[PDB]
């Protein structure tokens, strides 16, 4: 169907934890976002509980009207936490140095045994898994082989691009990777680092299922208010596919 | 008698620094705040430059339409910066939580003088303690900013009303000694009024609660609301 | 102190329960209200769980930024729930329509001590009746909430001025006994001012008229308008 | 032709009846909706008059600028009321939950002819069942409204895609028989698009989710957003 | 208590009748006004049914959340219509040439018998009567004598004033008349012709109970929307008494 | 293919004239409309000058940022004014309702020529009648504006779809004869789309419905909404 | 009494003339301002017509719903235009080196005869005259002797103050000058250079009748829109007197 | 592809300089515009610094979140400033009588050597250059020969058209010129003088890459506020390509 928007509210919690009070509350932000264009809410539960906390996840699981995408590292703690939470989606990301690739995505091709079992365990709990990876054919083929139904292409390099040519090259790499990914039966997401000024070229990629976006929305929100920030992003995304 | 609002935009920077991009930019937040009820903009240039950075301070000094309140610790590095930057105000802070002025009379006395010679109006961030207020007066600072943190963090209505009375008495005491008095740390939309109602209060410097409301409603409305509640309290 | 506004979000759940879905969610409404002028949120946990449910109270207790006022009947089940929940306030009501305190002195006395033991400030919902008020003071309650329903349902302006005067005298009487006094049931945008102008009023707990305005204009505006009218009446 | 939106304002009355006051008034909500994207207003006059009352229908019939869709059970009382009222549309529903037309051919046939005789366009509320659809065509109804409740309550995405496909095939079947087809029960802001994209859909009659959104954001915005999402799906 | 605002919605109907359709509907405007600062709604049922119609009055009587002020001429038709409608208030105004004074108000002093009976009949039906009159002591004393509980001072001349001095003179006349009126036990209203720029001096008059305003609000409304137009007027009125 | 909107502000004047003051002023409404989606402003200078007046026309000619469409009857007085005023457009109207051009070929032929010599683009307001359209073509007018009144006033969906088909055919017919075609009289927010969807339509001139929505929501939003619905229809 | 706000829309014409187009049009700005808190509209018809033009004045004179305050230099041309135009107010300002003071105000003391005839001529035309002067006793006595009913004190020096002390000094000077002028029978205005951050101290001065402000309001409008800019300035002024 | 909008904020500085104050500040305008649909911000650093100043450029270069388009005349001073500044784009325009065409565009044909070194020098600095020229084939061939990657066609004559025919003629001229330029390898922009009522026909031209508009947007902003003015212009442009 239409391109979906997942809104990552981690930075609502970073603002909160900066002072130790209860506000602003990620629970409030999730309602605002889900009623302004978000089709899902993403929260990354970190080992260091730097922003989102166990309390946020527990309450969010009961208050979200749409569905949760739990971003987490592939460790025994997170896996168990994920199985008991039962979020609709789970997005596996690199936590430490021996988890990420030279560009930032998960190293799936080099850890097939771990990834295969993670995917299987989460799947058994009824969670749809997405593997956050670089737009790299080796990782994509590996994602498919280990059984993950989704992959989320890391759009950071595209976003960080320091020149037009560098950006177009990265865009083309993402587009070609998404096409290759779909040919393997994978569903493909993206979103990390996307902004109001570079999101359309990514949203225009036909194979994209959902763009998971956080920072730029929250950064617009402090000026503009979360409702308009989410709605503007969703509007740009639909225009792009138009 | 005309209560002023100083908006601390440090947390705009915190949000930015969390990812290393240029947005959101403190410079934008300052224009919004100044046109929504802020009478001044406050930034705390920390040693680790974790949120506000030297770039921020340099650009804001050239873009603020009102005036800057530079929050900083008392060190030679910071004093030097202050002197060079020439902010309208400077709020000496540590780095109960207030600045120990009574325990470092020499250091604070020299700090105030130097900053004062740079044309900067100095305020010492202190606890609502009679000993510290006297020390502030004695050392020569024009302003003190009473730490409202304990008032904000109060757990019960009783502990709250007690910290309130302590601040009110501390303010009247400070004023009887020639000092101008500010407050603001930790104030929220739900506890700001009792503090705004204190006659001696000159300016309330508030940050976090405003930014927290802003991520939901936008900075302009967050600032106008806080300013409206403050004037209601004096009214 | 400023007149407070407690917003009763029960009818948000009424709207939700008419269909068995999870929306609209009282948890969202509480955030909106607390940021639009409410100083407290009221929920009435009815034995039949018509609207607010155990889930609601459980989550609200964790998400409210201000404080909870738990409206409830004086029964073992409810007293147990209240002790466990630890809301900041508890408003005891019947299962004119006010609580019969004067005729159940022992029961109310036990209830108040028990809730007070759990650190809960108790309010007895009663008619503007001096016998009931004296009894409320006698059984140890720190608060009473005067039933404004008769005033609100006044059929003629004569019955209205008459009910208003009754409430105002009752309030003055309650205060002279050391009680703090609330009100609010049935108040609307057109009749709230006369009640808000009564000096002894501490907090007005209003629900229905605000939610009825909200379905048209949105909750934020519905709450801010009620708070604005209340403060206008005081000044 | 453009996909139409009928807004069911029943829950405005639910909110009103929970207290016996005159607000919020369904008559106001109808004006708001009609000017924010609604092409029709739906009210369900239940025998128990739970929400919408005779007064409501009476006044609405005179104040609506668009047209009325009267939801009602197939009983003598209701048929009489409908004939007298002359709404532009009548939606027959049970007292999955769709009308059993295939098993009451004579009754539905009498109902349709009778309402058609009063100049009313009849819609039979039925399940996405080809047997029920064929029967609806056979008894003379010009419209059927497919029950989207099962689709809306889908527990898994599998059950959802399955219910969607069932509705879409049923719709195509209904159109091939000369019937016009509506839908809408249980649709929300997150699941309306897939139904609005079905080519044969004429009008979506939605209630609960819009009113649930309204108590938060106001009715005007709640309606305009639903209409916007519907038109986006079509293009 | 506080100064009240009655909003006259006649001109919503004049816009409607100009074309013969159902919109705009006075019923909608009454809801908007009552929720934006109006404490009452006024409608003038004219003999020629030029704007407000019998249908408007009939529906309004059932939809108003506050109270209706039925403006009408003193004729047998209107009196009977008023008795059966039972609006909370009734404001008697001049219809023809033998009904008004040289400035526009009702001629009460010169028609004591009619006015006395009108007042009595309406009062019997439980309607609070207001006599629309010029700021003229003779008419005011007569209003009191015929038993009317309210008078509405015609503020048209004040509004039409063509010079500052002319306005101040008219203001002072209104102020002195209101004071005289109250000394007779009368409650006093005003409002006709008031605008966003001259309403405050009138609202500042202590004896004023309610200002009934129509045209300027509707005229602002077509630009601005009725809600803001009503709220702005109510805001100015309360500032004046502040 | 790019549908234009002409906003008739006559009814702003009607409201003003009802009381003899200067407000509301058509001049203000024209700026609002032109910046909210109007591509042109229309005013009908009637003989009795009941709403728009000579002052209005004289000032608007100097303040409009887009262009004026002068609606007027075919008389020497009006032609003279038009010639002097030099409006960009002129819409000849009577004073089924359309202009009888076929019955006054001589008069209309001379009218168009004179106005055309003054540099004015002429449109003849006519019924969707083949005889009148041919006459319009024959007499030399560049534009015709099809009277949509009967379409608007239709009582049933059948009478409506019939008037619609008549207008659509009339438009294609007019275009096949070299004429540019407009419409607009009586269009509302609920029936405008079917007319906007007609390919041949150049500009829709609409007045009353817009002003009627405006008294509720404000002119800016009323105009932007109508323009949005029109572009949606072509889209 | 009621502190008034006059909004100077000159800079709207400034923006326009920068291109020779017809927009933005001062006539529109005037309607927006008058409905958002302006009690009067001010325009300075310069000899060189740098911004406001004769058409502007001619049309404005017909569309203003409140009243016009025509700022102009004292010359036979302008005097004739003023007498022709008949604006409610006329504020005489300096435009040439031999008309201005070393502070920026009109030099009335140095041109007693010229000002005397100006005030008399304009007064016979029914125009209320104000002399834009510095907060200087010599000029004030001069303004009083020549017969002008109003003076508008130049708040520019107060506005441009660089230190809190310099500012406190100028305010004091203005407050004493206002009292001094009132003791001579003059009514007093101010306004030039006032901003959203320094308007309150001036508005608080009791003798102030009207603050004529332009620049800061337009500067705010370019960002927030004219309506809110005017409404906000008006709100601040009433709060000060509150 | 995606039609871009560059907003020229020069007139914000225009308003400011009219008084020597610091407001309104172009730096604020740029943040508002970039978050409301502007894809770039344009500033014309004039030799005389009539509006935009060196500080403006210096600060803007550090606060812009999108990119700068520096309009400037061709002189050693400006070239050095540009090379120093390193804006993403540079649009060379005429400023003196011997630099302009009888239409208003830059005279590239008549100064091939100068333009040739400008383009080369600016290009080594990594700046993309655009030559602001008339819709004239001689200038276009010249722009192509000298090596500029972009040309910006002067839409002023189209904007100032007085008759629908005159306008139709200019549009045609621009559309053919755009196609002609693209056939020579140039990318093409336009924008000068475009308004909310004539922007669509230009936006519809396929070869258009970016429309740089300023004046009409600021003129609308003074009334409605900058955010809506920018958003609305962007909306109209996308509708045209729709």
Curated annotation (Swiss-Prot), chains A, E, G, H:
Binding site for 3-amino-2-oxopropyl phosphate: 8, 19, 193, 214-215
Active site residues according to the UniProt entry: 44 (proton acceptor), 71 (proton acceptor), 192 (proton donor)
Stored InterPro entries: Aldolase_TIM, PyrdxlP_synth_PdxJ, Pyridoxine-5'_phos_synth
Recorded catalytic activity of this chain's protein: 3-amino-2-oxopropyl phosphate + 1-deoxy-D-xylulose 5-phosphate = pyridoxine 5'-phosphate + phosphate + 2 H2O + H(+)
Cell compartments where the protein resides: Cytoplasm
Site (Transition state stabilizer): 152
Family matches, as Pfam families: PdxJ
GO MF assignments: identical protein binding; pyridoxine 5'-phosphate synthase activity
Positions that bind 1-deoxy-D-xylulose 5-phosphate: 10-11, 46, 51, 101
Entry keyword set: Cytoplasm, Pyridoxine biosynthesis, Transferase
Domain of life: Bacteria
Involved pathway(s): Cofactor biosynthesis; pyridoxine 5'-phosphate biosynthesis; pyridoxine 5'-phosphate from D-erythrose 4-phosphate: step 5/5
HAMAP family: PdxJ
Assembly behavior: Homooctamer; tetramer of dimers.
Protein name, entry field: Pyridoxine 5'-phosphate synthase
Species of the source: Escherichia coli (strain K12)
The organism's taxonomic lineage, starting at the top: Bacteria, Pseudomonadati, Pseudomonadota, Gammaproteobacteria, Enterobacterales
Gene: pdxJ
């Amino acid at each position: 169907a239409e391109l979906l928007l997942g809104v990552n509210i981690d930075h609502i919690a970073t603002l909160r934890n900066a002072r130790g009070t209860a506000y602003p509350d990620p629970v409030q932000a999730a309602f605002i976002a889900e009623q302004a264009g978000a089709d899902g809410i993403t929260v990354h539960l970190r080992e260091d509980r730097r922003h989102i906390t166990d309390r946020d996840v527990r309450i969010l699981r009961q208050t979200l009207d749409t569905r949760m995408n739990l971003e987490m590292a592939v460790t025994e703690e997170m896996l168990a936490i994920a199985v008991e939470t039962k979020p609709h989606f789970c997005c596996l990301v690199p936590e430490k140095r021996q988890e990420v690739t030279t560009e930032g995505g998960l190293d799936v091709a080099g850890q097939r045994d771990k990834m295969r079992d993670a995917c299987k365990r989460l799947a058994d709990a009824g969670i749809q898994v997405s593997l956050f990876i670089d737009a790299d054919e080796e990782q994509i083929k590996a994602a498919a082989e280990v059984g993950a139904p989704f992959i989320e292409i890391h759009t950071g390099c595209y976003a960080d691009a320091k020149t037009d040519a560098e950006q177009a090259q990265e865009l083309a790499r993402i587009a070609k990777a998404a096409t290759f990914a779909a040919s393997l039966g994978l569903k493909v997401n993206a979103g990390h680092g996307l902004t109001y000024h570079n999101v359309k070229a990514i949203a225009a990629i036909p194979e994209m299922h959902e763009l998971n976006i956080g920072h730029a929305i929250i950064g617009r929100a402090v000026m503009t208010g979360l409702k308009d920030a989410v709605a503007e992003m969703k509007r740009l995304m639909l225009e792009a596919r138009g």
